[PDB]
Ligand binder design. Structure first.
Ligand SMILES: [Cl-]
Ligand SMILES: [Cl-]
Ligand SMILES: [Zn+2]
Ligand SMILES: [Zn+2]
Ligand SMILES: [Zn+2]
Ligand SMILES: [Zn+2]
Ligand SMILES: [Zn+2]
Lengths: 397, 50, 396, 396, 396, 133
């Protein structure tokens, strides 16, 4: 991995810095690194791709070194370097693709393609130079088992789930008390509804609770909490839990009461936020507990009093929402997020060449299935393929 | 045998010492039965070693 | 951890091999390692801590080397070696005990005692030699980010739980349909009971399902599947879910029908066994799903037909049971089992010295609470203490 | 097999002993063996895996020797050694897997994979060194036709069989005399039942006999014998022999009378225990003959006398039991057992790569079918694959 | 004993390491030890005696030394080594058998056979080398009055006893209160029964106590506790204490109440567990006290209330169980256990050669009698024979 | 601040670039900067913490310089460098944490922690290099 990353880094630096007219002093160390790469790779045969529709490519390296007698780089020098760089970049792209489409249940963090296995030999370790990208840095820290960190803008931590819970219900579904939520990506929208508006409640308070368990621990998380849940604030016809019938949801939104956001780690309260809306910080947590109350307004204007009668039928149903958005976070594990393209790249390569379903990843790289059952073996394989994808993105993209 | 007894044989020599600590604070001369007062270090603890 | 294990192994080898009359060639490398250990430890002061009732102990090392110039070891050699070996063994045992009674939340895999942190310095890396035991081998492999596993005979993977689910019930508890189970250690006994014997069930079949979610993945697991649960095969008086009243269970055991045992990983079926009993192999799984059916016997002799009337009262209740015993398995993580003494050693050391409850483990190192909430921090601390306990076992 | 084991053993020693800071004297012999292995393997091409979903792997060996000049091992030495060790460990694991998934009816003891066939050449015999594991030791003894020995904790010698025999029966199944048993794994639970409680039996004694013929001879066996068979001690609705109906069994457990457990070899009584319960020793046997009796209690209290009338209907059925557990034994043949993982390893490897059913083993490596028809060809193939699996478990 | 163990260890190492093609550097120290053994044994005449049917055997040692001038061992070297190894292995096996069949009241720890007494002379102490086995380690420790330790999986600590105690009884045996237990091997099943279901008991609580005294102190024991005892959960017809009559037991299982398991050392409570079942640790104990209560359920459904009337007749009898299984433990004394074969080996050797009963051991090496009256002389003789059995099992 | 940033960036470049098998020409300038930092920091005593539950920590620097290799770095070089890099990273993290938890109504832009105030002395300006973030 470090050797493949170093190949890609050397090639990207060569493309960026070996340009017409530049001082040789601007590239001397880069030229030495490039020639070291050429020397190490010369005389070696590689084979990439025998899986799915990925073609078998055979790679031979017999290249001359770049010169060192120039004081400024001229056109012919740059063109020869570009020819060598093009061949090397094609090779690196193919090796990355071959590694991205493979998975192992045993040693998923280890190389799977034979090209990367060959690059894992001692003779190629000479190619290794600056490992400064975030993914390769995390890779090297994880190899030594140091505290890793991946920063995610809008981390894709919640598998998609649109469901509801009925605490009070009956076959007519005209007097319902419960909660409906969407946990999708980096967002949780929850809404507690009471059809009676807590008329017969103990002091006219109806308590609602929602627990979201993260499959991985998040640290240094910026989170926006907004009082209302726009997703569950319009008329809906919702299937019953068994799907036997459908019920009606005609919400009228009241502000939530005694809002309490609890960020917990291993069932211990790390952060608590009471009646606080806007941006909050959850420093280290794996569970979110949102508790909020529907409080019947003691004083109502004639229209409001007309909304909520003393008994059934209840035509307007009192609803209190909550929206939670994780804007940014840090996780010790790789995740899909809004800003990066690692998952997109891996899925695109796997779909482009019709890679058969393997024993590790879900049947098509579906992220909901992956994050739902984010097992250690899956974590290893995902980190490996994501690091390879980031390496490839330095050159192919 | 020679390797394990090297350090003992070397430290028995009367014409070489095992080092010198330069500590720019004033340290009392140790009282040793073989010298009287002697600026002798038993070990190198507490000093950077070059 | 590798240095502590190396000290322990050097001392164990010295005890085993430094014996009167033995050829020096039988111990030459051992004596070299022993002298290396002495040289590396000489001039160092160590302190084993005062946590709990464990006394503060101070350790000094100013030992001479062992001789290397005899053809056969004699009594003088063995006595001289034993004098040093006793002190070193005492020091290693105290360091192991000090490390065993400590825990951390942030970094539970790192050393916790000052002695083991001092031994992790570069200056002691010379003591390190053969790391061959299963626990130290796993420790080194895991520090290398390498796939490694602990092999357990009768792994203690199931937190103790004796519970039931009533899918059909009433306040008088006389027409009940549901499941009873005990998940304990490496054993699962489950039983589906129907009081009506599926008299009014579609096709006269009642389906029961029991899912056990293992807290860690097990691999290459040998399992005994038997078609009856003797734990739920005799009359019982059982509390209700809220404990308000007690109900009566009077099983009559029928053969379970359409027995399907699925071993699943990430929700995908890895192994499936239909109507198979005896030894089965679950190669890699984290969940067990037992589906079975109570099938009303289409033909019944008069004695049988008497037991199952068309309606209530139901005095004989039809029950079908399964028993699943995990004889052996492999886990990435550490677990208590019937063969190894790591949990027992750690618990004994913590109990003897009145170690207060820490922020990681439950009080008394109780295994049910520990395995119920097997968090990553708990796993790290538990592997650390188990490795230290195995190291201590070599000498104590 | 000896060369493959030697490769695995050398690699395990390298992983456990080539560690940073260790004295070179701790590894000198190991470094010599490792360099010999490198020299022997250099310049050779191997191919593993063309069966099932096992991928085709090509192996080329071009490695430098390890240094012999350091006093203590450092980071550079360990890194070079680790790279070579990783490649060799992967090769050994793949060779073991390739051998484990193959079988032969003719020469199943001989190597099946081409890689192991190549390793059996003289040019690799130099790699061979210490063969200390029990499985390789037994392999070598078997090659010379010396007496082999495999020690098993809870040997899996009885194929699963839950059946019954009715010596007296009628269509209504209300006056039955017979036996019902479970012979599973290492346990035999057998119960003889009489519905009349030997009211008309001569001397009011009913004799029950159960003979279990082991497929292989067991020696130095420790057996727990308990009077009662709890598995057949509760009410039970049991299918008829042809499955055309079900009958009722309402046991009341009387202690067995004149218990005689004989352990037979070639039909001769090697061991015999009369009314002995607890731990007994069977030194050499291939058959277990459990003969017991239901003796009608000559003196009964009013409740007991109420259980057993003078004639039908018989609502309570007198049952005597026997439980026999083989805790440990020694066999000259390989067997599955609770403590080892050879059967699990072979079955897992065959299931993971979807190895088609061959001409030797049952589909899925079903142990009940394997031990039911434990033929010499099956024995040879099973010993081969179990030895390869033990070799593989040293590294994987 | 250490010389005999060293002979066996040298022979085992020679069998394992002296293989064709191996580097001489792999065996140099082993070859030196082997040649030293040959020199020491050469010219000595031994006789393994004719106690019982064991044949008298005469042993003469005139063997040439193994060569030291090869780079790799070849077939000539291996054959020359193997002839001597075979003869020496036969001699060691016969010496071990001679020692295992012998005992004495006075000095049972000392050698009994003439051959082992001869090997205890100083002129054989040169043979002594690595004493790494658990049994030989403990033998050397005990010869020095040091803290010994044997790790047992399922130790056979409880002598077999299926007994009952009736704290309330009468000739009819229709209103009984008491306890019945099976203490076998590592398992204690106990069950307290009340026929009246504590209708007239104070507070409707019936207290049951079971004290089991272990004949040796167990340390670092992991124990599984389970609420119910399946062995006393089915209807039985149990003989009376005098055997004059039989009474009837028809249990209905209630959960035990206020369960207290105390592990005591010299009457001092070392460990206490209240209402905890899953898995517990007893760090050091010699007595187990199981306290458990039958509590009449204050609220009953109509069926449960039907089970338990206000007065006689009592047809359903309320029973509260308890199962206690020692999975593994540590003992300073040797014990039979489910994993080792020492007891089996000694019993087999004594049975096969018709050794007459001696003053120390009970006839047939019956383990129940042995552990019931585990005297110090019995402990010494048993440790001697078990160590010899472990030595023999290294080669046979 | 610029000196603290330069320490942190020197350590980041040391972690990223001092890797086994890399050409010594890939790190020559970085090694020179790192050795200059070692020279400037050696013999200085620093204290962090003492506010809230942030522990009081004492930092001493008595490290030797990173060496040179003819062509490529080996494993020994990387471990020897990593010991020093780990200590310096711990020190920098502690200094940053000490500075983050402090505030001042007057001169809020100025360093508030004693360690950062000491790092603003002239003697440490030598450590200052590329300020590119
Ligand atoms: Cl956005
Ligand atoms: Cl067991
Ligand atoms: Zn509904
Ligand atoms: Zn209920
Ligand atoms: Zn066992
Ligand atoms: Zn029938
Ligand atoms: Zn009685």
């Amino acid at each position: 991995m470090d050797v493949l990353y170093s190949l890609s880094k050397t090639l990207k630096d060569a493309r960026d810095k070996i340009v017409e007219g530049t001082l040789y002093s601007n590239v001397s160390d880069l030229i030495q690194q490039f020639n070291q790469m050429i020397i190490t790779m010369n005389g070696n045969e590689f084979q990439t791709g025998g899986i799915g529709n990925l073609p078998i490519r055979n790679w031979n390296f017999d290249f001359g070194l770049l010169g060192t007698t120039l004081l400024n780089l001229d056109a012919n020098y740059v063109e020869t370097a570009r020819n060598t760089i093009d061949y090397f970049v094609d090779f690196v792209d193919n090796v990355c693709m071959d590694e991205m489409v493979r998975e192992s249940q045993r040693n998923g963090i280890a190389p799977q393609s034979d090209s990367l296995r060959k690059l894992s030999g001692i003779k190629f370790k000479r190619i290794n130079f600056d490992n400064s990208s975030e993914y390769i840095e995390n890779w090297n820290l994880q190899n030594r088992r140091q505290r890793t960190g991946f920063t995610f803008h809008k981390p894709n931590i919640f598998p998609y789930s649109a469901s509801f819970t009925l605490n009070r219900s009956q076959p007519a579904h005209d007097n319902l008390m419960g909660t409906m939520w969407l946990n999708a990506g980096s967002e949780i929208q929850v809404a507690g509804f009471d059809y009676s508006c807590a008329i017969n409640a103990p002091a006219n308070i109806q308590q609602f609770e929602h627990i979201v368990q993260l499959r991985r621990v998040l640290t240094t998380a910026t989170i926006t909490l907004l009082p209302d849940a726009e997703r569950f604030s319009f008329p809906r016809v919702i299937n019953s839990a068994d799907g036997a019938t459908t019920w009606y949801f005609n919400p009228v939104i009241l502000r939530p009461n005694n809002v309490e956001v609890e960020f917990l780690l291993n069932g211990q309260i790390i952060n608590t936020y009471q009646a606080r809306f806007g941006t909050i910080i959850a420093r280290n947590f794996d569970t979110i507990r949102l508790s909020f109350q529907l409080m019947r307004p003691p004083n109502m204007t004639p229209a409001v009093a007309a909304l909520f009668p003393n008994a059934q039928p209840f035509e307007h149903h009192a609803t209190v929402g909550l929206t939670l958005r994780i804007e940014s976070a840090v996780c010790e594990s790789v995740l899909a997020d809004a800003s990066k393209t690692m998952l997109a790249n891996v899925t695109s390569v796997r779909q482009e060449y019709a890679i058969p379903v393997g024993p590790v990843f879900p049947p098509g790289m579906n992220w909901t299935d992956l994050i739902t059952n984010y097992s250690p073996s899956r974590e290893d394989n995902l980190q490996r393929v994501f690091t390879v994808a980031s390496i490839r993105s330095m050159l192919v993209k | 045998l020679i390797l394990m007894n090297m350090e003992q044989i070397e430290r028995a020599s009367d014409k070489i010492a095992q080092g010198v600590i330069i500590a720019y604070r004033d340290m009392q001369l140790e009282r040793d039965e073989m010298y009287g007062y002697v600026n002798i270090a038993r070990n190198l603890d507490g000093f950077q070693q070059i």
